[PDB]
Design a protein around this nucleic acid. Structure first.
Ligand SMILES: [Zn+2]
Lengths: 1340, 288, 66, 251
DNA sequence: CCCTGTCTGGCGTCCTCTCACCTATGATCATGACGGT
DNA sequence: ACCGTCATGATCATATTATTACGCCAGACAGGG
């Protein structure tokens, strides 16, 4: 079955793979993250409650006072979104917090407080998010973009090759906390082990192991095994486990049990290990040279002298053995220090250590942190407990503790946010294991190590920084005042919190201005995974590997949609199905392929769970049950593609659209384009502009409805029902009774957004697309937006294209367009500019907005009123006066003399300089909206009161229409109530509406229903009255302005541009081009029917720039228009619905096993005529991305129309009238106009303004400036022999002021001659070098 | 990657094949967008080291200049002499390859007509004047530069050659990338240079010099091939000999540095004592 | 090398328009160095004719008339 | 200078000089107040660091900052760097009588001429048109001529075709790498807003037509018109200076 | 005393276009609204 | 309805701390066989 707007124009759909998971709501990152941020969240985390429970309770400097936390609450915003964008306020909500003050007594902090106080306090204004997923910061709609950064936890990197220039790789182990001090263990080419803290000075690593109160005996107990030597009657025998001897060449003949096992000069084989462990050999015999370099573990003391025989971690010599042998020790514990197995890295590290106990280690750490100051044991304890071991200054998150347990092969993924002793010891153990040769290092670009922050987490962090500044302030004030007399709003102030969150949402590196000129550009700017910003890398520094697609971007981050230029691969865009995990990683759906059958359950895999399993490719053929029809199937195991067996697979992809993003899944035939041209096509499809009447894509991907509905430019129905009143302003839906609340009677009103300014100066319009009396379903479009049509997504328009070289006018990439295109007004877009005129107060006098202007004509002022502000709807050109404003200046130094002189003349003679607001140079259009903002306490002029009366009548009429049509629906429900149970058929409509609420009826649910509808009537009346008074007091009151500005007049122009030679058009595959000549109709190549082609491209761009998808799109577009022409022929002849049903059914079956399977036998002879009314301008065809329409299907659809099979029609010429040889390719391509127009780039300057510090011309176009004759152009004129051209190019034309006035006089008198002089900026160089101690001069 | 992309663009690429393609193309876009900075900074360093050098005389009055030969790596002759000595003024007068003839005089610009009369006579190599041998204080004389290159004549007195040279080296910086024995090919005559050799017992002329250059000179006089032959190699041929096309003329073992002799006699182990100097390692799998 | 050779010039404006200006200006200041202009970039800085192209006749004239 | 509003956007050097003078006044008052030594030492040390921060900021330990954490720019940072005086105002300057627009093909051209729009032509050639208008006698004062071309009457287009005729212009594509990226043409006036550029010449500029832009410069004086015609004309650059290969090869 | 890791400074592409946005505060006279007579 | 008390906004000098995540490549410096 189909929805009613899907019976308007049902898009033909090729495609073979039956879908199982539809496209999710595309704005779920923004909305779900910010819903996670601000919501009443119990059990501590996440949200604002994490900050308010981690920074509170603020306890004082031993004054026994404490400011603890209860709850919080956000009130309603004072301004809704529309008033906020008009006026210019933040769209914020006040954050009320309930804080409590307790004050303990003396001698008992475990005793009773004498007094508490709990109260409401105001702090900050956090800006809310609109339903589109955007913020309104100062009247401009902004987006905070997700950041891709390093996952907190341990990370074992390997500084490969480059250091020490000898190939010896290093290994470092960076512990990355979520908040606190970093910690980098590493090696050095002497194979010592070095710690460092926050990239500071370097210490040997075991100095922190003493700082955790480990003795050296315990350290060697941890980081090494033991070797036991027993002195038993002969040569100091040894306990020997032969696994340590795997490949070691002994120094003697190892024999045991009277049997020679190992010979001198040979090594111990594995089978000799098997012999020694099979015979269970324990004690062997060593020479005196065997313990010549064995390292003792623990301290041995002589019992007689009380001295130290040998210190811990010391090699043993002959005299040390002679000392400990005669002291009474039979057991000797040493360490095993092999070449391959276990290096003595800990032992060499302890030999570099000067420290000996806990105190000296804490002193050295306190000294490397803060250099050159006296340490104290209390200060060293406090610092080292506040580096890693305190809840305040150090905090791994749950993400950090998960990675730290997972990368150390733990079991519990839950732990504390602080470190411990076992954590650092396991980091050093894993680092030594990686150095020993077992285990692997961790790459950086692997997406199991890249977390995604979003709006909620970053706003929480900035709010937490605001709270730690305010806890500094509260710790200052709380124990330095008189208690009890104050309340907890005199202490805490809202300035740092609001400053922090307002600085983050106002100007950050990630809170950026929304590129809004297209529904696609909105919905793909909100889904952006930027690597830049705070905590990430920078563009001009890094690098190589991060600008490259890793093998685990498959289905998480799009590989082909990224901006080319200085940041490729850093401004990644997130894919279609890619959600975000609980912790912050990326996860993507799969289908659990149990042993034979592809089960239709979806199952979300992360980036590290994907690697262990084995995933089948998306388009693998399966026969109606899930059994894979091949016995070798293409899969990928551990980041590496291969060919696997039938039933060793564990997952299959969901749909074939999931590698790409929503920017590059609206490209039909994506699998035929080379990836560079698909990248450029997706980026230019983002850069489109909305035309005047957007049409549709004939060749789409079926993804248009998700991008249109799941964005916020269309007016989606909330509750379905029957339309009651359509208008260009509003749309009224009457809600069906099986969807309807019992109370609040309810018929919905959609106030559409008519012509208003977007951010990119386009024209964000909404047009109603429903008829009257029409049913609509829940979840359905009512009003099309900009670049939409019937709920689809129509960016550009589809035009008749031919690929042929035509007389050179399409030489490199150019495009040649018939005048039939510009006559049909089909690339005419609507822009809205917002010109502003401020009127301040100078210290020479205030400015005025009077209509009287000095030294202008009356014809220049006839477009103004009596008040000096332009009428609504007068077409102005460049230079017309919109706001007549003159500078209220002068001031002749006051005094009595001038005081009595001003009385004679009176008022102001002519002390008003002209500074009116004018139209910019070279636009046109219509004044559509004028606003007058005025500071309260200043006289409002006549047009200000006129606009106030206009808006007051508009608001009162609009709210009266709200109440009137709403109660019209309510009385129409009342009549439906009174007919059941006591009908008055003809009696009811005579007696008035007041006496419907108080007519009697039987006591049932019907009388209770009457009571409900009555109280809803009366409540809506009183609510109407109070909100009308509130709306009037909002309109009539003054407006906040900048300090020292009287009044602001804003005028909205609506320009209506067109096409010309120089604009940029482009298709959807990377075929760019400046349109080069707008030919007449007659010159176009026509065919043997009569129709001229509209656009003549260039064929030579196809074999080099390998975008072969545009030719398949051209042929399938010609097939679509062939079906549309046959429908137009079968309908223009007024044929009955039977033949239309026949032909539309044949055009909708037409293929292999497909997904569509429609039938027109359930459309009932009236929808088929309206469906053919919508198909007569062409039949829309869906072609999904990697499961598209093959060549034979395009041929069979070109055979259904009577078009030629090869797609090529022979074409005649327009000029000569004789045939082009070798018939050419025509069809329809869907081409987009880009907003790189030519009357926004063109600029010219003879002589304008000049800069102030260096007397050179200004830069830019808005400032009337000149083009930079840069350094390489100076080199290119040195490279010729052009010497006078360069002399006037950098002395006369640019800098020398007397030189250029002599030049201007000489040019207007006909004498081409230059008086050179000196550049004035060289004199600026002399003053800047001379302002140092340097004495630069000019000799002779 | 061991599994290729067997599908072209007219057939459809499936998903994995397009993803491997995107690896290969993202690397190229990152390389161009980061390569352009080094290309521009190279042009800047080059035009600021040049910056001064102006053609300021007409003859420095010298007889020195570099010896332009065709360049040969070991394959077929890569860049011919007419590409290197086109429009550069000769240092001394080139002798015709027959005997002691004044073929061209000693200060003639070699334009296309002179270079064709050089190619007819098969001239070996030209001693030509180079800019690095110019004797002009503070500039380059007009003959030691050469032809104007965009004008047919010699460089004019004045035209800045340092800046056009620096631009011409640094301008192709974008197109550049950023990130057994000898088998003869043709059929000609053998010649050896830097050679000190000896005949072995079998007859193959072995070489007692490491730095020996093996040239293959044709029947006309020009040098068509060149190779480097190590110390102690088995040459199948000798000096001045004629060979066939494809015949192996050299042989050696680079993993075994030959300590071959000049004379014969008996061998004594001087300062070779087993135990300290040398060691006894009887072979496992052979016995010798 | 080319950056060490263009910073080691007998003309400190030529070696100051290029890389580090601090090192070159202190070396030229404490040496009391003097810049007989005589090159292309000194005359692009100071605003006169290039002594290469059309201006080589002008610099011949000025060098002759000293 | 103040920006648009009521406050003064002050430079960084005024912060540096104002701190040196504040500290110097404090040190004169202390040396006057016979303060003790341990800290007159602090006063002179703060003056030393203030002077050292004024001259070359940041060469000493971490550079001082006004707003917000970004360090403020000192005198040596007005000299050095990519944005000092050498590389930004003395080697490369911004230039009057110059224009910029999007290019397009126009294959009817001869290779010594390029298309140039009428609006750019009337803006770049305002003084020549003023001189021509004052020569004929149509107007009197300069003001009258500026009103005439501000209104664009019917007689200034003949004046414009009589100032264009034999007057070359320097077309320049924005990344100029070698000398063939600045070439001089003769204008042919274009109804339109896009520079029409002869196609063969495109292979010299590395200019395709996918959205490119070029700048036009006007040789003002008479020696510069002759240098544009005799050295930099597009007919004169038919061989690349890097070698002997022709650069006007058909693409 | 001649190698040597190690640390510190000094580079890192030109041209153009659009948009928004630059510390906090700690102390007090004087204006301004609220309540008693 | 006039007079006196609490509250709330102007002008004004006071002077600097608890983040890290480039990649060579010269150039100068303390350490040690
Ligand atoms: Zn010379």
């Amino acid at each position: 079955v189909y929805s009613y707007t899907e019976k308007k124009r049902i898009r033909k759909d090729f495609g073979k793979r039956p879908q199982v998971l539809d496209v999710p709501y595309l704005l779920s990152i923004q909305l779900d993250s910010f819903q996670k941020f601000i919501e009443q969240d119990p059990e501590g985390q996440y949200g604002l409650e994490a900050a308010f429970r981690s920074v509170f309770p603020i306890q004082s400097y031993s004054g026994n006072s404490e400011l603890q936390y209860v709850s919080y609450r956000l009130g309603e915003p004072v301004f809704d979104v529309q008033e906020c964008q008009i006026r210019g306020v933040t769209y914020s909500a006040p954050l009320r917090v309930k804080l409590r003050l307790v004050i303990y007594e003396r001698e008992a902090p475990e005793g009773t407080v004498k007094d508490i106080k709990e109260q409401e306090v105001y702090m900050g204004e956090i800006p809310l998010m609109t339903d589109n997923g955007t913020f309104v910061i100062n009247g401009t709609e902004r987006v905070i973009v997700s950041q891709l950064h390093r996952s907190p936890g341990v990370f074992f990197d390997s500084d490969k090759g480059k250091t020490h220039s000898s190939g010896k790789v290093l290994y470092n182990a960076r512990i990355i906390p979520y908040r606190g001090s970093w910690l980098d263990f590493e090696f050095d080419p002497k194979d010592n082990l070095f710690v460092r803290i926050d990239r500071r000075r370097k210490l040997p690593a075991t100095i922190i192991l003493r700082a955790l109160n480990y003795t050296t005996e315990q350290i060697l107990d941890l980081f090494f095994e033991k070797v036991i030597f027993e002195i038993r009657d002969n040569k100091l025998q040894m306990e020997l486990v032969p696994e340590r001897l795997r490949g070691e060449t002994a120094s003697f003949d190892i024999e045991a049990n009277g049997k020679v096992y190992v010979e001198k000069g040979r090594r111990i084989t594995a089978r000799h290990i098997r012999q020694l462990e099979k015979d269970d050999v324990k004690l062997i015999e060593v020479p005196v040279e065997y313990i010549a370099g064995k390292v003792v573990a623990k301290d041995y003391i002589d019992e007689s002298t009380g001295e130290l025989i040998c210190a811990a971690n010391m090699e043993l010599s002959l005299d040390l053995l002679a000392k400990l042998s005669q002291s009474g020790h039979k057991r000797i514990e040493t360490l095993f220090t092999n070449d391959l197995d276990h290096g003595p890295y800990i032992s060499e590290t302890l030999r570099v250590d000067p420290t000996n106990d806990r105190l000296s280690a804490l002193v050295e750490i306190y000294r490397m942190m803060r250099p050159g100051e006296p340490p104290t044991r209390e200060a060293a304890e406090s610092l080292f407990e506040n580096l890693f071991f305190s809840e305040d200054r150090y905090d791994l998150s749950a993400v950090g503790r998960m990675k730290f347990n997972r990368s150390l092969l733990r079991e519990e993924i839950e732990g504390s946010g602080i470190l411990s002793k076992d954590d650092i010891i396991d980091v050093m153990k894993k680092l030594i294991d990686i150095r020993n040769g077992k285990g692997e290092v961790d790459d950086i670009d692997h997406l199991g190590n890249r977390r995604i922050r979003s709006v909620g987490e970053m706003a929480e962090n900035q709010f937490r920084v605001g709270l730690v500044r305010v806890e500094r302030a509260v710790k200052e004030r709380l124990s330095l005042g008189d208690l009890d007399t104050l309340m907890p709003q005199d202490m805490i102030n809202a300035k740092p919190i609001s400053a922090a969150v307002k600085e983050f949402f106002g100007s950050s590196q990630l809170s950026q201005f929304m590129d809004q000129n297209n529904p696609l550009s909105e919905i793909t700017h909100k889904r952006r995974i930027s690597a830049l910003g705070p905590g990430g890398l920078t563009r001009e520094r890094a690098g190589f590997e991060v600008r490259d697609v890793h093998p685990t971007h498959y289905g998480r981050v799009c590989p082909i949609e990224t901006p080319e230029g200085p940041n490729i691969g850093l401004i990644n865009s997130l894919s279609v199905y890619a959600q975000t995990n609980e912790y912050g990683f990326l996860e993507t759906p799969y289908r659990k392929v149990t042993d034979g059958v592809v089960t239709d359950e979806i199952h979300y895999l992360s980036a590290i769970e994907e690697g262990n399993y084995v995933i089948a490719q998306a388009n693998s053929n399966l026969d109606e049950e899930g059994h894979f029809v091949e016995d070798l199937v293409t899969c990928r195991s551990k980041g590496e593609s291969s060919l696997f067996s039938r039933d060793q697979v564990d997952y299959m992809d969901v749909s074939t659209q999931q590698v790409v993003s929503v920017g590059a899944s609206l490209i039909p035939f994506l699998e035929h384009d080379d990836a560079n041209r698909a990248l450029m096509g997706a980026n230019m499809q983002r850069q489109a502009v909305p035309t005047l009447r957007a049409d549709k894509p004939l060749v789409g991907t079926g993804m248009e409805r998700a991008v249109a509905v799941d964005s916020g430019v269309t007016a989606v129905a909330k509750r379905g029902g029957v339309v009651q009143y359509v208008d260009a302003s509003r749309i009224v839906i009457k809600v069906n009774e099986d969807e309807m609340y019992p109370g609040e009677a309810g018929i919905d009103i959609y106030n559409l957004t008519k012509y208003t300014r977007s951010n990119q100066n386009t024209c964000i319009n909404q047009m109603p697309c429903v008829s009257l009396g029409e049913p609509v379903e829940r979840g359905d479009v009512l009003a099309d937006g900009p670049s939409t049509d019937l709920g689809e997504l129509a960016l550009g328009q589809n035009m008749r294209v031919a690929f042929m070289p035509w007389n050179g006018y399409n030489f490199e990439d150019s495009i040649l367009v018939s005048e039939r295109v510009v006559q049909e007004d089909r690339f005419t877009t609507i822009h809205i500019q917002e010109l502003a005129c401020v009127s301040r107060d100078t210290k020479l006098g205030p400015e005025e907005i009077t209509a009287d202007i000095p030294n202008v004509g009356e014809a220049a002022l006839s477009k103004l009123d009596e008040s000096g502000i332009v009428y609504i709807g007068a077409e102005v050109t460049g230079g017309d006066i919109l706001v007549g404003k003159v500078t209220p200046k002068g001031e002749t130094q006051l005094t009595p003399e001038e005081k009595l002189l001003r009385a004679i003349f009176g008022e102001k003679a002519s002390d008003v300089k002209d500074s009116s607001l004018r139209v910019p140079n070279g636009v046109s259009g219509t004044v559509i909206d004028v606003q007058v903002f005025t500071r309260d306490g200043v006289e409002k002029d006549k047009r200000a009161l006129e606009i106030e009366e206009m808006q007051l009548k508009q608001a009162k009429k609009d709210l009266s229409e709200e109440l009137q049509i709403l109660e019209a629906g309510l009385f129409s429900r009342i009549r439906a109530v009174l007919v059941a149970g006591g009908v008055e058929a003809e009696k009811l409509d005579k007696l008035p509406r007041d006496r419907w609420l108080e007519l009697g009826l039987t006591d049932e649910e019907k009388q209770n229903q009457l009571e409900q509808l009555a109280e809803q009537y009366d409540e809506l009346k009183h609510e109407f009255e109070k909100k009308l008074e509130a709306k009037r007091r909002k309109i009539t009151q003054g407006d906040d302005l900048a300090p020292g500005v009287l009044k602001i007049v804003k005028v909205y122009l609506a320009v209506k541009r067109r096409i010309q030679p120089g604009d940029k058009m482009a298709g959807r595959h990377g075929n760019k081009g400046v349109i080069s000549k707008i030919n007449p109709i007659e010159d176009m190549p026509y065919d043997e029917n009569g129709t001229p082609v509209d656009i003549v491209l260039n064929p030579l761009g196809v074999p080099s720039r390998m975008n072969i998808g545009q030719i398949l799109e051209t042929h399938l577009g010609m097939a679509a228009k062939g079906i549309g022409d046959k429908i137009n022929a079968m309908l223009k002849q007024q044929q009955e619905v039977a033949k239309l049903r026949e032909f539309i059914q044949r055009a909708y079956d037409l293929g292999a096993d497909v997904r569509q399977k429609v039938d027109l036998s359930t459309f009932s002879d009236e929808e088929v005529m309206r469906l053919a009314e919508n198909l007569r301008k062409g039949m829309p065809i869906a072609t999904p991305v990697f499961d598209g329409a093959k060549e034979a299907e395009i041929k069979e659809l070109l055979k259904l129309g009577d078009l030629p099979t090869s797609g090529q029609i022979r074409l005649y010429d327009g000029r000569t009238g004789e045939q082009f040889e070798r018939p050419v390719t025509v069809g329809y391509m869907y081409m987009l106009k880009l907003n790189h127009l030519v009357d926004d780039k063109m600029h010219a300057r003879s002589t304008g303004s000049y800069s102030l510090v260096t007397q050179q011309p200004l830069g830019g176009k808005a400032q009337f400036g000149g083009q930079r004759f840069g350094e390489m152009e100076v080199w290119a004129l040195e490279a010729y022999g052009a010497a006078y051209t360069l002399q006037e190019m950098l002395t006369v034309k640019s800098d020398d002021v007397n030189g250029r006035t002599k030049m201007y006089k000489n040019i207007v008198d006909g004498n081409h001659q230059m008086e050179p002089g000196m550049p004035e900026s060289f004199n600026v160089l002399l003053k800047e070098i001379r302002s140092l101690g340097i004495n630069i001069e000019l000799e002779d | 990657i061991e599994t290729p992309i067997t599908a072209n663009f007219r057939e459809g690429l499936n998903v994995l094949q397009y993803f491997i393609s995107t690896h290969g193309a993202r690397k190229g876009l990152a390389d161009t967008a980061l390569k352009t900075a080094n290309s521009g900074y190279l042009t800047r360093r080059l035009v600021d080291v040049a910056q001064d050098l102006v053609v300021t005389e007409d003859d420095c009055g010298t007889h020195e200049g570099i010896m332009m030969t065709p360049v040969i790596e070991g394959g077929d002759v890569k860049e011919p002499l007419r590409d290197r000595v086109l429009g550069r003024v000769t240092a001394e007068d080139v002798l015709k390859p027959g005997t002691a003839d004044i073929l061209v005089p000693r200060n003639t610009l070699l334009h296309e007509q002179w270079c064709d009369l050089l190619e007819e006579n098969s001239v070996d190599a030209v001693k030509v004047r180079s800019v690095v041998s110019c004797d002009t204080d503070f500039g380059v004389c007009a003959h030691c530069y050469g032809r104007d290159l965009a004008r047919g004549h010699i460089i004019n007195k004045g035209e800045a050659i340092g800046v056009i040279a620096a631009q011409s080296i640094g301008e192709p910086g974008t197109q550049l990338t950023m990130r057994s024995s000898i088998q003869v090919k043709n059929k000609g005559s053998i010649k050896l240079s830097n050679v000190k050799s000896v005949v072995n017992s079998s007859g193959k002329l072995v070489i007692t010099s490491r730095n020996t250059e093996l040239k293959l000179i044709d029947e006309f006089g020009r040098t068509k091939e060149s190779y480097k032959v190590p110390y102690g190699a088995v040459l199948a041929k000798g000096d001045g000999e004629q060979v066939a096309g494809g015949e192996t003329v050299a042989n050696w073992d680079p993993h075994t540095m030959p300590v071959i002799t000049e004379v014969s006699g008996f061998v004594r182990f001087t300062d070779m004592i087993d135990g300290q100097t040398i060691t006894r390692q009887t072979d496992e799998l052979t016995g010798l | 090398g080319i950056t060490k050779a263009s910073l080691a010039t007998e003309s400190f404006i030529s070696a100051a328009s290029f890389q580090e200006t601090t090192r070159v200006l202190t070396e030229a200041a404490v040496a009391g160095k003097r810049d007989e202009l005589r090159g292309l970039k000194e005359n692009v800085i100071v605003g006169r004719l290039i002594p290469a192209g059309t201006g080589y006749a002008y610099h011949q004239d000025r060098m002759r008339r000293r | 200078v103040p920006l648009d509003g009521g406050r003064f956007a002050t430079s960084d050097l005024n912060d540096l000089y104002r701190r040196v003078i504040n500290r110097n006044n404090r040190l004169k008052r202390l040396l006057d107040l016979a303060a003790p030594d341990i800290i007159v030492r602090n006063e002179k040390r703060m003056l030393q660091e203030a002077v050292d921060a004024l001259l070359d900021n940041g060469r000493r330990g971490r550079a001082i900052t006004g707003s917000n954490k970004r360090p403020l720019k000192s005198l040596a940072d007005m000299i050095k760097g990519k944005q000092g005086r050498f590389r930004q105002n003395l080697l490369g300057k911004r230039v009057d009588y110059s224009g910029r627009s999007v290019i397009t093909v126009g294959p009817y051209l001869r290779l010594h001429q390029c298309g140039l729009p009428k609006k750019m032509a009337l803006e770049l050639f305002k003084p020549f048109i003023y001189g021509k208008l004052e020569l004929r006698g149509l107007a009197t004062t300069i003001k009258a001529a500026k009103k005439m071309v501000e209104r664009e009457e019917a007689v200034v287009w003949d004046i414009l075709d009589e100032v264009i005729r034999e007057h070359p212009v320097l077309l320049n594509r924005a990344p100029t790498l070698h000398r063939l990226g600045i070439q001089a043409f003769e204008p042919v006036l274009i109804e339109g807003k896009a520079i029409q550029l002869h196609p063969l010449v495109c292979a010299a500029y590395n200019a395709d037509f996918d959205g490119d832009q070029m700048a036009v410069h006007v040789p003002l004086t008479l020696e510069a018109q002759l240098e544009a015609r005799a050295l930099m004309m597009s007919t004169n650059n038919i061989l690349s200076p890097a070698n002997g290969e022709p650069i006007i090869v058909p693409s």
